[PDB]
Amino acid sequence: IITPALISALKTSFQKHFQDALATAPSTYLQVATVIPSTTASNTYGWLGQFPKLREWIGQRVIKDMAAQGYQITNKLFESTVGVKRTDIEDDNLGVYGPLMQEMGRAAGAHPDELVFALLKAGNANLCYDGQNFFDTDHPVYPNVDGTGTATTVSNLFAPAADPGAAWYLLDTSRSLKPLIYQERMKPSFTSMTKEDDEQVFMADEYRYGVRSRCNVGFGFWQLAAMSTEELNQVNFEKVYDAMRNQKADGGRPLDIRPNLLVVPTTLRSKAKEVVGVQRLANGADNPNFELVQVLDTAWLN
Amino acid sequence: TTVSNLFAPAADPGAAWYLLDTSRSLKPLIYQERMKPSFTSMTKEDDEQVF
Structure with missing residues (x-):
């Protein structure tokens, strides 16, 4: 009645379903995030900060004693499972149980994007290495290389006096590191836990199936990322661009910053088109910013 | 807890409109497929061919 052949065939079918669902899932975090695989509990990021430069070597060779402080990414874990209910063994009604595996593949493929974009939106409620919010009006900027003396207040968050509108982000990808870092301790994996001599199977009436993964997302350095709740207009976009650059x-x-792309929700695609990607301005003159940046509309930002 | 998915006025209800989401792999509605449509050709049964 029960032989290894049937179990192997069903496991292969489920594995093929899940792999096909996951492989074709869209990937979007890679564009605005950096993947750094690891093989430990966490990684230390103390090199984010000062911008390396060249000296004239008037005297001796300067050696940089890197700070001992770390970002403490502290990766996490998470996963989901289902059951089969064993109903298929008797009647072989295999038509069902497909969409569930497809949903698993979609969720596994799409979760990293959701987490990355949720962290991006939460920049106003997350602390960076400076000890303050990622988007804050009092970022630390020292007047000396050693990092001493009275600093200056720099703000990259802009909001009208009241009734703030939709929020749009301006990012850069020219540098080696994107503003957001997506760690990957282990690629998501699925376990075809289905045995006849195992347990919670003979006493239950289910064939549980599970997936496992380990990953986390964290901020980088705020020199690039900028946020603004102002209405997306030419004047405001120009102000943000020239302030960031x-x-x-x-x-x-100057750091020689080169803003690359501007991220807006799908709601502001028309404004993104009017500012960039079309030859008509509001007044109807030729754009001075045509194809200056590569817009990336997404549904993860509503 | 109270969960409601049907918002209607006190009286004189108007047209009914639906809000749906297709983010998940499977949608809120399911359509079975037992047998594909098939057309059967049949004339000569001594009935409804010539008679």
């Missing part, structure tokens, strides 16, 4: 490191030296 005019960033100076310690000692008032």
Whole structure:
């Protein structure tokens, strides 16, 4: 009645279903995130900060003593499972139980994007290495390389006096690191737990199936990312662009920032088109910012 | 707990409109498929062919 052949065939069918569902799932975090695989509990990120530069070597070779502080990514774990109910063995009604595996593949493929974009939206409620919010009006900027003396207040969060509108983000991808980092301790894996001599199977009436994964997402350095709840207009976009591109490191030296793409929800696609991607301005003159940035509309931002 | 998915006025209800989500792999509605449509050709039964 029960032989290894049938169990193997069903396991292969379920594995094929799940793998097909997951492989074709869209990937979007890679564009605005950096993947850093690891083989431990966490990774230390103390190199984010100062911008490396070149000196004239007037005297001796300067050696940088890196700070001992770390970001403490502290990756996490999470997963989901179902059962089969064993109903198929008797009647072989295998038509059902497909959409469940498809849903698993979709969820596994799409979760990292959801987490990355949720962290991106939560920048106003997450602390960076500076000890303050990611989008804050009092970021630390010292006047000396050693990092001492009175600092200056820099703000990259803009909001009208009241009734703030939709929120749009401006990011950069030219650098090696994207503003957000998506860790990956282990790729998601599925376990075809179905045995006749196992337990909670003979005493229950289910063939449980589960998936496992380990990953987490964290912020990078705020020099690039910018946020603004202002209405997406030419003047506001130009102000944000020129404020971000005019960033100076310690000692008032420009960083040569090159904003690449601007992220808006699917609701503001029309405004993104009007600002960039069309040859008509509001007044009807030729754009001075045509195809300047590559817009990336997404549903994860509503 | 009280969960409601039907919002109607006190009286004089108007047209009914639906809000749906297709983010999940399977949708709120399911359509079975037992046998594909098939057309049977049949004339000569001594009935409804010539008579």
